[PDB]
Design a protein around this ligand. Structure first.
Ligand SMILES: C[C@@H](C(=O)NCCNC(=O)CCNC(=O)[C@H](O)C(C)(C)COP(=O)(O)OP(=O)(O)OC[C@H]1O[C@@H](n2cnc3c(N)ncnc32)[C@H](O)[C@@H]1OP(=O)(O)O)S(=O)(=O)O
Ligand SMILES: C[C@@H](C(=O)NCCNC(=O)CCNC(=O)[C@H](O)C(C)(C)COP(=O)(O)OP(=O)(O)OC[C@H]1O[C@@H](n2cnc3c(N)ncnc32)[C@H](O)[C@@H]1OP(=O)(O)O)S(=O)(=O)O
Ligand SMILES: C[C@@H](C(=O)NCCNC(=O)CCNC(=O)[C@H](O)C(C)(C)COP(=O)(O)OP(=O)(O)OC[C@H]1O[C@@H](n2cnc3c(N)ncnc32)[C@H](O)[C@@H]1OP(=O)(O)O)S(=O)(=O)O
Ligand SMILES: C[C@@H](C(=O)NCCNC(=O)CCNC(=O)[C@H](O)C(C)(C)COP(=O)(O)OP(=O)(O)OC[C@H]1O[C@@H](n2cnc3c(N)ncnc32)[C@H](O)[C@@H]1OP(=O)(O)O)S(=O)(=O)O
Ligand SMILES: C[C@@H](C(=O)NCCNC(=O)CCNC(=O)[C@H](O)C(C)(C)COP(=O)(O)OP(=O)(O)OC[C@H]1O[C@@H](n2cnc3c(N)ncnc32)[C@H](O)[C@@H]1OP(=O)(O)O)S(=O)(=O)O
Ligand SMILES: C[C@@H](C(=O)NCCNC(=O)CCNC(=O)[C@H](O)C(C)(C)COP(=O)(O)OP(=O)(O)OC[C@H]1O[C@@H](n2cnc3c(N)ncnc32)[C@H](O)[C@@H]1OP(=O)(O)O)S(=O)(=O)O
Ligand SMILES: C[C@@H](C(=O)NCCNC(=O)CCNC(=O)[C@H](O)C(C)(C)COP(=O)(O)OP(=O)(O)OC[C@H]1O[C@@H](n2cnc3c(N)ncnc32)[C@H](O)[C@@H]1OP(=O)(O)O)S(=O)(=O)O
Ligand SMILES: C[C@@H](C(=O)NCCNC(=O)CCNC(=O)[C@H](O)C(C)(C)COP(=O)(O)OP(=O)(O)OC[C@H]1O[C@@H](n2cnc3c(N)ncnc32)[C@H](O)[C@@H]1OP(=O)(O)O)S(=O)(=O)O
Ligand code: NI
Ligand code: NI
Lengths: 260, 260, 260, 260, 260, 260
């Protein structure tokens, strides 16, 4: 029923499995359109819990935002109706829990996507990287905020400023992951927890989830502060460095950033 | 001088011990009113630190809200002057440190109560559960907010959406607990910390505790957002699921939740 | 060049070494003025990352706020223009990452200073304490807020109410520190990470740092609540206890606090 | 095409005329559902400006909330999905200007409804009253806020505390109305302005309307404050006085309020 | 029963008449303490509306803050527990409408006091001046906020930057006053309105006043911004100019301000 | 001296007169850069009050934003460092009162500019229009906020949705202006007020001006609401209507807006 995802229903749990292996489940507009369609189709009282996953044995869970779909320069790369912006809002507003079940490496926007979900259960061999400083991308306020609700600020700044992968074991220690399991146990450990959640009161889960969403968003600022940040972001997406970051990825080389 | 608590004073440290074991120290109106009177009576310059505890050897620290006293009549069960709501505000505004010293199992409202205190020191055998999804209860914004200042969002959502107990060891790992001690060392570990705090400057403690309280509360939202959440909560406490949750608990059977 | 700091530039990384061992790198105005000038002078495109350190082998990283300079004539000791308040603003607003590379003991205002920095890498023998309750100091809102973005509320309250030192191992476990290494590896580990950061896109680093700063600050309150807190702080810095704390420190004796 | 409104379209201007004169255009659920359906049907690119009006010659523009549909005792009479609450939100979110063109007397909820619209043009004989204090109604935060964006606090508190009618001339003087015109010129004057607005850029109008909506709503408070206000409101809608106010209106007698 | 006020109650209305004309009803601690005790004594269910007035034929309604009680030698003149700050909070939180019935001239803190009240009815010969720039006083955030809810910013800035008296006619036109009437009608007009308000639902009045109070207060800012403003205010109350403003007032001469 | 403004000092008052009559004082980058330099040059203790004026006899006070300098499409026209955005911040943060003394017609950005000033004194023949809906411009949040602190919402929505001029008399009536005077009296009346202000306490004026600025900006919102607004603004500046509005102005014809 979808080109880019496969949905299986097990009792009251729906498992949405990525089927975009040819672009390593990059969050291209058409992939995200199918994932959002599949979530919408599952917004029914007989479904009580969602699992997001890559196919069994995947080396790459998701390669993150489709770098080819980023603008060439002079345009905001992460505007409100960008597909990554759409899917994080939809996950956060969805009235059922969404568990990210992670096998393989997770990159950039895909790391934000799983951080926006309710629980993360990961393989012992999974790895996690936050990548805008590799490309010169001015990440947006909402996107950064979605990275700050689990690990502390020092941990988050190390992840973003180094863009270095962290292990599942370190991700568990700093509070990013709920559980780390051997890859052979991942699917059944995650399904056991999803089935348990599915026996609980779904209207209580939905309103508690919404209350947590609203409290998590409730860091408020005045208009001048937001427009000041937007002007800083524009200077970045106008920079030579942003174009060097895009070109280095296209030419498969290490970018040379100079600070303009 | 109280029916439902025993108070011992050791120089500048006051220990408030639950005396409601008949009802597993459930947070009934008469128990909370005594606990609040005892705290009020200890608000004197000669007292510098409070310890809350269950009696030595308790299997159950507190069974949480008295489910007989939960409003069933399409009436908000966690309104501003509900005893649980009163005691958390009082604990948080109290100008001395309050340490929860936990032996036995902690449930629901009693988990929110210890989370509202300043430090938690627990026995290695103690266990912790947050239970509103078991009953279909739409936990209130302030109450949920009180669960979000220690562990991360993914961890909080696991605790609430599963309603599964966690060990003291996991509660320490995720940042809920300050210390975990062998049961036979719990009382003297907690007392030595309370005596030590009692040597420090009480006016500096009080103003710093109050500054943390107001920074912790300073997640702000507009009226529309609050009224929208209140409407969602009312749809939950009006639901058939909420009735089924209450009735199943009291009739000692598994509830059948349907999403209405 | 600078009287009170030494700067070594290695490729794109600047290492700022404290040179105030006379007062164990206490935050005297003359020392902070030199540190802020040295930071300002490093705000140039060819510098990509800063390390702050005490001299190799230091027993004391920083002894904290200069207690001789703390106002005890009954004015606010932590007003907006105080050296500690100035250096934390400058570190947070600095468009390059600032890593605190810690060897030795860290006290009070120096603990707030490293908490305000982006990443903290510490020696396994380093120790950390937050000390206002030893002196009767009413720590200000911004300074307390700077302590709340890494460890949870319960842990922060234990640190502040006890003013007890914690080990590097505990500071890592509770999420204050990024990494703990053997002293012999501290320069190698820290420089490797700083050089790595220095290959990344500096304009993306700067805007994301600023986004995190403004999100971190975005706990808002009304004027009445601020003026109320300021009145409570005044009552503390006018107290007999505050004079007793200051005198006790200068006379190298134990303060006796009485709650006025 | 509607039972309770009549819609006329003149180029880019739509006039929605009430057709509920046998209940004096009271804001009953059936009337408001037709009004909201008519607005939704007009959310089309070629419609640029809406006028809301009562029929020509109306003595009563609207008698406000249907007092027979106000919750009798114990339920919030002004919950998020109450019809008055739904229509003010829809008017304010609607991406085209909505002009209230007022002939006759305006009461209670209907006064809040025209205040929620973008412009008010009124007959010289029109009158305005805000009536919750006649009935003992605890008007909700969003609804009170909707009355505060035109005239000052003192003038708003006079209107609500007295429940006395003001003339169109006073309503113009204090900043509630845009224009006052003789009743024979009201339709022509309002249509000329609507046609003129309709020549302007609709996407600029829509985004500026939405910017004003969000700035108007951006009075934020913490969860405890909202829950405290909700507890005060519940005490009022649980009061003897609230029952007495409803009873007195329906028995056409002077209420006897006693402050419980 | 009071030295500095006279209270008369008829039916459900109380009139608090100032009795401190030998000091032109200056807001000395002893006068504010009596006014607050009189209002506290009237917080009874049978009292439903308060009027504040000067005696019949007063030239000076209130000469404002007693300049003799303004702190010199570097304390904040408008700290949270200053009598003017206490009375404005008490009026705003008082669960009954408070009408200011004004005959004569209104100065400085007394202008803030009447602005904090619910309605102002004034004689046609009344005059109003806001005076901090006369004395070099850094008016506090709450106090300035209390002046912004009636007239627009440009008008408020004219009143403050000029310190020039405005007529009752102009005060009515700009939205500061509810009504202006000839002196001989002032008491009859105000009593008619107070007695009319006292027949309305008191619990509805109280909750709506409190909702307006919290919405009015709900302009929120971060800790840094409040601390930055406080540093600015301290520099002013530490200034040459502030000492010169007070000295000039008490020596009955014109200050020479120099901007230090 | 300046190419595009003329500055006169009279005692402690500085008058900045526009000298760009060949472009009807349009807010070009070269003009704004000169006005800002002149303002910065006058930030001196011997200057107490600023007046902004057009030359005596001007038909046009300012034609507003230089339409030639708006970016053609796909670019935000009112970014943080746009000249209009810069000048309004600088006027608002300027520690001396700035009085707009208006002869002639005021358009668009020039209307936002005088609104951002402290007081407006205008000739009886002056006229005022706010014009973004003539051109299809998505005005920014800060810009709109600057139009909301004087007149009420219904009045501001009329001015913006119609783009029709208002007279000085109506602008006085709705709270936009301080004073309207005959053109022959304008200069003398404005100078007398400016000289009067110049004898008051400048430090008190500066801190109260800054308090008002921050209270004025203190309408706060979460990141998502800001980014949702920016997405809407970008849909407008990407629109065919935006291109049509600019092309119509250039080609001197009536635009044909279609809603995309
Ligand atoms: C902008 C935001 C964002 O999400 N950016 C994307 C962040 N993602 C990344 O940085 C991952 C970039 N890719 C990689 O590091 C490697 O391709 C990955 C994931 C490790 C796996 O390496 P492999 O050697 O197995 O495969 P290989 O290098 O040959 O690539 C296979 C084909 O897929 C392509 N590819 C990979 N990632 C992306 C992507 N994110 N967007 C678009 N295309 C992608 C890659 O270029 C290659 O294409 P072909 O050469 O045409 O076959 S931000 O950075 O968070 O701000
Ligand atoms: C509503 C909020 C809240 O705090 N709800 C309450 C959450 N509390 C719980 O879920 C704990 C429920 N109870 C249990 O799990 C077990 O009773 C525990 C506490 C482990 C005790 O086990 P035991 O085997 O020793 O005793 P047993 O199950 O036989 O129960 C003995 C009698 O105590 C009763 N009881 C227990 N808890 C409560 C309660 N919270 N309110 C009212 N009654 C309670 C239980 O019904 C039984 O009563 P009898 O039938 O008279 O023997 S919320 O959920 O957080 O939103
Ligand atoms: C107010 C905020 C704050 O930052 N308070 C300060 C917190 N700092 C402290 O508690 C550390 C106090 N210092 C010490 O305990 C000792 O100096 C420690 C670190 C244990 C090291 O002992 P030593 O015997 O090795 O060194 P010694 O005591 O002789 O000091 C060397 C010279 O520097 C001086 N010194 C030290 N600390 C400070 C300080 N915080 N402020 C001002 N001066 C300090 C110390 O007095 C000595 O100077 P001389 O006696 O003149 O040689 S708050 O508390 O966070 O609110
Ligand atoms: C909850 C909010 C709200 O909007 N409350 C309702 C506010 N509306 C009012 O207070 C209007 C009350 N009614 C009146 O003042 C008069 O009925 C009105 C509008 C002036 C016109 O008087 P008339 O002489 O032409 O007709 P008359 O008074 O005899 O009543 C005709 C029949 O209609 C009825 N009626 C009127 N208004 C309402 C209403 N809002 N809800 C329900 N019924 C209403 C009135 O009771 C009478 O009924 P019958 O005697 O059976 O024919 S609140 O108050 O703002 O909080
Ligand atoms: O005497 P006041 O004018 O101060 O107030 P009060 O309500 O007693 O009397 C005025 C009469 O007019 C009525 N009124 C209320 N609101 C409106 C309105 N929006 N348009 C027209 N008339 C209005 C109000 O009901 C009152 O009439 P009665 O209740 O019959 O005494
Ligand atoms: C500090 C805040 C505040 O509320 N400041 C106070 C603002 N109040 C004023 O500026 C009013 C100052 N006073 C005057 O303008 C005149 O005294 C007024 C009130 C018009 C009355 O004129 P009169 O000719 O009838 O009486 P006269 O000028 O000779 O003074 C009578 C005696 O009372 C004294 N007086 C007056 N006002 C105050 C005051 N606010 N605090 C302390 N004393 C005051 C005045 O100095 C004179 O004193 P003696 O000659 O010693 O009997 S602030 O400025 O808003 O921030
Ligand atoms: C975008 C923001 C903004 O500030 N927009 C600009 C708003 N300003 C306007 O709409 C005013 C546009 N101009 C007019 O209304 C009239 O040109 C004005 C002030 C009344 C004077 O008309 P007159 O008949 O007296 O003289 P006339 O029109 O013949 O002289 C016109 C020459 O000057 C030019 N002009 C005028 N205004 C501007 C402007 N704002 N930017 C650029 N050029 C302008 C106009 O195009 C014409 O040029 P030439 O005749 O070709 O030399 S927004 O709209 O607030 O968002
Ligand atoms: O007259 P309306 O108010 O109904 O709108 P409309 O713009 O069509 O009519 C007025 C004419 O005056 C113009 N206008 C716009 N803003 C201003 C201003 N601040 N000062 C002077 N004139 C202004 C507006 O361009 C319109 O011009 P024309 O369409 O050429 O008649
Ligand atoms: Ni927060
Ligand atoms: Ni406001």
């Amino acid at each position: 029923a979808y080109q880019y995802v496969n949905v299986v229903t097990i009792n009251k749990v729906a498992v949405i499995e990525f089927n975009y292996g040819r672009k390593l489940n990059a969050l291209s507009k058409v992939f995200i359109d199918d994932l959002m369609q599949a979530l919408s189709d599952l917004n029914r009282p007989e479904i009580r819990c969602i699992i997001l996953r890559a196919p069994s044995g995947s080396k790459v869970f998701s390669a993150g935002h489709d770098i080819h779909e980023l603008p060439s320069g002079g345009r905001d790369p992460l505007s409100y109706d960008d597909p990554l912006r759409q899917i994080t809002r939809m996950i956060q507003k969805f009235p059922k829990p969404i568990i990210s079940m992670v096998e393989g490496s997770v990159w950039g926007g895909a790391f934000e996507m799983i951080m926006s979900s309710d629980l993360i259960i990961a393989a012992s061999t999974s790895t996690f990287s936050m990548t805008p400083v590799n490309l010169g991308v001015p990440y947006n306020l909402v996107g950064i905020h979605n990275l700050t609700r689990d690990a502390g600020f020092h941990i988050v700044k190390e992840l973003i400023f180094t863009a270095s992968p962290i292990t599942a074991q370190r991700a568990l220690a700093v509070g990013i992951l709920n559980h780390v399991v051997e890859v052979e146990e991942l699917e059944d450990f995650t399904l056991q927890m999803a089935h348990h959640i599915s026996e609980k009161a779904p209207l209580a889960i939905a309103v508690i989830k919404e209350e947590l969403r609203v409290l998590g968003e409730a860091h408020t600022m005045n208009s001048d502060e937001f427009e000041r940040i937007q002007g800083m972001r524009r200077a970045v997406y106008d920079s030579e460095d942003y174009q060097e970051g895009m070109n280095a990825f296209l030419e498969k080389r290490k970018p040379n950033f100079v600070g303009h």
